[PDB]
């Protein structure tokens, strides 16, 4: 269930611990899910108010959200998570091909004319 996106069925299994306590393992399983949603809050989202993504992990309203809102972006504002979905700087590269391909074109001519 951790392999696919399913998170709620994971914590339905945190309502289902049958054998022994499993306490220290699911509490590490808390922490590796805490940064994961703090990782997956960083996708291309819109404004989220301070209720919706406030409760996607577990929490009601502690200052733990500011511990995540100042760790990454999505700036603390008027009931808002600000979206920095720019993804604009990297394209329009002729140069990165023009170094690599000029290598490759001569590499074509090596095993084309010179007998090996």
């Amino acid at each position: 269930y951790l392999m696919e996106g399913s998170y709620n069925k994971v914590f339905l299994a945190k309502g289902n611990i049958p054998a022994e306590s499993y306490t220290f393992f699911i509490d590490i399983l808390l922490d590796t899910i805490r940064d994961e949603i703090a990782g997956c809050i960083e996708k291309a989202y819109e404004k989220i108010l301070f209720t919706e993504a406030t409760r996607i992990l577990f929490f009601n309203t502690p200052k733990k959200m500011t511990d995540y809102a100042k760790k990454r972006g999505w700036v603390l504002g008027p009931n808002n998570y600000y979206s920095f979905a720019s993804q604009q700087q990297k394209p329009e590269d002729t140069t990165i091909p023009s170094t690599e391909l000029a290598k490759q074109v001569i590499e074509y001519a090596r095993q084309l004319e010179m007998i090996v």
Binding site: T94, T95, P97, S98, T99, L101, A102, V105, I106, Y108, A109, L112
Partner: peptide
């Protein structure tokens, strides 16, 4: 059909640099 192409492709990709 090789040397007409490989020359003309390579000579164009140096003027970009």
């Amino acid at each position: 059909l090789m040397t007409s192409n490989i020359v003309q492709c390579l000579a164009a990709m140096l003027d970009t640099v």
